[PDB]
Design a protein around this ligand. Structure first.
Ligand SMILES: Nc1nc2c(ncn2[C@@H]2O[C@H](COP(=O)(O)OP(=O)(O)OP(=O)(O)O)[C@@H](O)[C@H]2O)c(=O)[nH]1
Ligand SMILES: Nc1nc2c(ncn2[C@@H]2O[C@H](COP(=O)(O)OP(=O)(O)O)[C@@H](O)[C@H]2O)c(=O)[nH]1
Ligand SMILES: COc1ccc(N(C)c2nc(Cl)nc3ccsc23)cc1
Ligand SMILES: [Ca+2]
Ligand SMILES: [Mg+2]
Ligand SMILES: [Mg+2]
Lengths: 440, 427
């Protein structure tokens, strides 16, 4: 047992969910019809992959997942796509009017009309779990649905499932692929509302992913599909410990103990390597030392910021593939001498290491080269607050003139909700400053 | 005089399983519980640790406990896993998440009565129960938090029995989570009040031995546990075999512990060997004696020359001259007399057993009650306060209903323990 239920919310969350579940099926040998020939446990089993897939008597392996959107367009492509047989129709939930890039419509006007149905569907998934561990919630900061409906759902989940674990994968906005000018408003509103209801949240900066596709995959102008194939690789690295068995496997919840020193400081920086084109991986094998080194190169981070000018409170390495502890320990030792890794004075400096032997998979027709070993680093660095600073500044430029605020007020929100949300963000930025100051 | 053995949590069950493998082999019991044994020394005191079942099978008086089923499945899958009584597997499903508070107050509380029921059944069949021995780590959640909860409840129901533990101290060099110093400090507070004897098995020392002495570049918990199983076999010798001493847990406690709270022992072993590779020259009794007292052979990372031995128990295993054993043991004391407190006359006692451990013609095991053990608790106290001064990682604990005040009391009690050990180092 220890099941995990994934919840995919709004355009970004749904489409990233498509990439992730496709990759999971390839990693576990699950066909588009849901059949898994190597599973001799027909209709059940307590295997590692069963944390993410349930099984029917007919041998079908079904994602423990719900897709929710306030309009039908994006989820309809799942209903008619390559993996349509994978999902029971009740797992794919759509309204008719989206949030129109408006947090207040996602949280209140449109969102409140479908929230009870969404919790009914989630409840049906939970009732099939013998040991439910928690939820993984995928959404954008910037969309009206990803921000407003997600925070409504997180509030309702805290009520309906006590303090059962809730983790987030959150898409931080970038000008290169953003869709709305009010994304800073929606980001601050949802970050404020969700902060108490989330235990751990992985921010993915679309500009960082966009740059990695351009720099390392030689993609001239990356699309959502390019970004999502890379994002799903990072999500897969983080969830690999939950989905695979392993002597050196370390549970994600055990990394969380180290990553979260105070409830509000729960935003780990993810760095992933190697991201390399097929043309360049050819006759070029990257060693454990090389991919580990790449985790301390800021250009490989999921969030643009500079950990060299911040302090570390934790550092975790999640390896997959042909890796043994001896190579890892050797790579870390040289890195410590050669790199700018400053820890805060109140936490130990060792690196926590997990190794899963199943090597990374790539989606056919993708851009990533298939490699023998990969690593995702998860670090708690004060540097991640820069991303809050950039967003809070953009929020402030517009809010001082109250630009666009009438669209939220017209849906029933009050100005005090904006300032209350911005004050929490200011206090968050200050929390990150304080944890970095030396003890007395 | 029966001993009831309890192993709790991941580390407790792994080192617990190794111990039962090792001493079963020494007593001529196979994984089925049958005795195909050479000597009869092997069976004379076999009831201290084994229940006898019909069909002349020997079943360990062992209870296996965990809040998580995984490592107990591996034990049952393991070599001697079929020897344990299946009713004595007591486990939950949710785990403890490396959290002392969950093992002690919330998850462990749900399961502890089932364990006490199994303890009771084993005790009621005992002719005269000596007491209990617990294997556990102090750095996780289950062995540490639920283990000390079990100790407290076992003491309430059996207040006139002896409580002995093998407690594995956490080390950053061999570390799972940052909160180990918290879990360890809360546990030591329990151990100080509620055990009569605890063997301090320091993962720091086990790591240093494997790396430095045994030249193992990347030590695993398997390499650490080879050392642990050898130490556990040695320190149990006089409980399990007939000799001039015929020891039990209470006599060990009486003769090793001059003041109730100072009951934490540095174990030592010689020769130090790595798993799988055997060396073919036996030591000389003079060599055994020097190595067993060498800081490089201590299983607790403390320098004995930084303190004084209050009491020492030494056991020599193998065919050797007891005259030479006596002379060499007298030699070390007479040449190093400053390191033995003058106010406990003749505080070194030696025992000899003919049966050697597997793979060695001769071995020496060392049990020291040294004031240098305070270094161990100081090290843990520094790591505790480094985080505790910023209240770092506390929410994992306050979320289970614990209060900061409880952390302050446990730290203060462990500092007092350090002071008391310092008091006798100068007398
Ligand atoms: N990485 C990635 N980001 C996406 C994707 N789709 C949308 N986004 C990001 O999401 C932000 C806008 O949120 P959306 O999820 O598109 O909006 P929504 O969730 O459908 O909510 P509505 O506004 O009501 O439609 C934009 O800034 C995009 O950068 C995607 O497929 N992949
Ligand atoms: N020597 C040794 N130490 C261990 C072993 N397994 C775990 N540990 C130590 O125990 C600590 C983890 O606690 P653990 O027992 O696994 O948690 P539990 O399952 O709640 O009891 C770590 O700091 C390890 O150093 C082992 O097999 N051998
Ligand atoms: C300091 O004086 C003493 C120390 C210990 C003991 N007793 C009871 C022992 N008990 C066990 Cl189980 N093993 C050994 C091994 C050598 S002594 C000993 C006796 C006197
Ligand atoms: Ca199965
Ligand atoms: Mg939309
Ligand atoms: Mg563990």
């Amino acid at each position: 047992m220890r099941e995990c239920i994934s919840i995919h919310v709004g355009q970004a969350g749904v489409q990233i969910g498509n990439a992730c579940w496709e990759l999971y099926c390839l990693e576990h040998g699950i066909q588009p019809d849901g059949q898994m020939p190597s599973d001799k446990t027909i209709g059940g089993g307590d295997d590692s992959f069963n944390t993410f897939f349930s099984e029917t008597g007919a041998g079908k392996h079904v994602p423990r997942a719900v897709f929710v959107d306030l309009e039908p367009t994006v989820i309809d492509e799942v209903r008619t796509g390559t993996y349509r047989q994978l999902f029971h129709p009740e797992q794919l939930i759509t309204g008719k009017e989206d949030a129109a890039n408006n947090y207040a419509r996602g949280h209140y006007t449109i969102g409140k009309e479908i929230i009870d149905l969404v919790l009914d569907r989630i409840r049906k998934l939970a009732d099939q779990c013998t040991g439910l561990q928690g939820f993984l919630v995928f959404h954008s900061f910037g969309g009206g649905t990803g921000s407003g409906f997600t925070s409504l759902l997180m509030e309702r989940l805290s009520v309906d499932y006590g303090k059962k674990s809730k983790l987030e994968f959150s898409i931080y906005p970038a000008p290169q692929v953003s869709t709305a000018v009010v994304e800073p408003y929606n980001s601050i509103l949802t970050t404020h509302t969700t902060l108490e209801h989330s235990d751990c949240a992985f921010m993915v900066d679309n500009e960082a992913i966009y740059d990695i596709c351009r720099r390392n995959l030689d993609i001239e102008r990356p699309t959502y599909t390019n970004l999502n194939r890379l994002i799903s690789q990072i999500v897969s690295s983080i969830t690999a410990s939950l989905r695979f068995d392993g002597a050196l496997n370390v549970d994600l919840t055990e990394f969380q103990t180290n990553l979260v020193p105070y409830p509000r400081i729960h935003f780990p920086l993810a760095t992933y390597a190697p991201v390399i084109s097929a043309e360049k991986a050819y006759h070029e094998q990257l060693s454990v030392a090389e991919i580990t080194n790449a985790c301390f190169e800021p250009a490989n981070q999921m969030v643009k910021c500079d950990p060299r000018h911040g302090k570390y409170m934790a550092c975790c390495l999640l390896y997959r593939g042909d890796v043994v502890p001896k190579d890892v320990n050797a790579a870390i030792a040289t890195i410590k001498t050669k790199r700018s890794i400053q820890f805060v004075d109140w936490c130990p400096t060792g690196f926590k290491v997990g190794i899963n032997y199943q090597p990374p998979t790539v989606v056919p027709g993708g851009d990533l080269a298939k490699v023998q070993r990969a690593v995702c680093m998860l670090s708690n660095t004060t540097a991640i607050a820069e991303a809050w600073a950039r967003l809070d500044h953009k929020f402030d430029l517009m809010y001082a003139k109250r630009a666009f605020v009438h669209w939220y007020v017209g849906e029933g929100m009050e100005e005090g909700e904006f300032s209350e949300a911005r004050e929490d963000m200011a206090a968050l930025e200050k929390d990150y400053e304080e944890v970095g100051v030396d003890s007395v | 005089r029966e001993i009831v053995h309890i192993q709790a949590g991941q580390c407790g069950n792994q080192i617990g399983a190794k111990f039962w493998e090792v001493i079963s082999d020494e007593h001529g019991i196979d994984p089925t519980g049958s005795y195909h044994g050479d000597s009869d020394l092997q069976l004379e005191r076999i009831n201290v640790y084994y229940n006898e079942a019909t069909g002349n099978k020997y079943v360990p008086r062992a209870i296996l406990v965990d809040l998580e089923p995984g490592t107990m499945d591996s034990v049952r899958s393991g070599p001697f896993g079929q020897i344990f009584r299946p009713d004595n597997f007591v486990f939950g499903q949710s785990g403890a998440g490396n959290n002392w508070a969950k093992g002690h107050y919330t998850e462990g509380a749900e399961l502890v009565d089932s364990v006490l029921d199994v303890v009771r059944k084993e005790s009621e069949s005992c002719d005269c129960l000596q007491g209990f021995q617990l294997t556990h780590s102090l750095g996780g959640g289950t062995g540490s938090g639920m283990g000390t909860l079990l100790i407290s409840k076992i003491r309430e129901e059996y207040p006139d029995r002896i409580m002995n533990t093998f407690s594995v101290m956490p080390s950053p060099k061999v570390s799972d989570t940052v909160v180990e110093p918290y879990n360890a400090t809360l546990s030591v507070h329990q151990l100080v009040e509620n055990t009569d004897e605890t063997y301090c098995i320091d993962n720091e020392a086990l790591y240093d031995i494997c790396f430095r002495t045994l030249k193992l570049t990347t030590p695993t918990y398997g390499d650490l546990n080879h050392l642990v199983s050898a130490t556990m076999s040695g320190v149990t010798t006089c409980l399990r075999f007939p000799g001039q001493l015929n020891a039990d847990l209470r006599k060990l406690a009486v003769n090793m512990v001059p003041f109730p709270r100072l009951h934490f022992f540095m174990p030592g072993f010689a020769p130090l060997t790595s798993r799988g590779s055997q060396q073919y020259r036996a030591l000389t009794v003079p060599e055994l004696t020097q190595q067993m007292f060498d800081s490089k052979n201590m299983m607790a990372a403390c320098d004995p020359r930084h303190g004084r031995y209050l009491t020492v128990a030494a056991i020599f295993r193998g065919r050797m001259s007891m005259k030479e054993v006596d002379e060499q043991m007298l030699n070390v004391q007479n040449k190093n007399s400053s390191y033995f407190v003058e106010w406990i006359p003749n505080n070194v006692k030696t025992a000899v057993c003919d049966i050697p451990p597997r793979g060695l013609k001769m071995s020496a095991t060392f049990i020291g009650n040294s004031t240098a053990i305070q270094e161990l608790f100081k090290r843990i106290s520094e790591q505790f306060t480094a985080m505790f001064r910023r209240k770092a990682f506390l929410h994992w604990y306050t979320g289970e209903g614990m209060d900061e005040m409880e952390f302050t009391e446990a730290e203060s009690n462990m500092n007092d323990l350090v002071s008391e050990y310092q008091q006798y180092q100068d007398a």
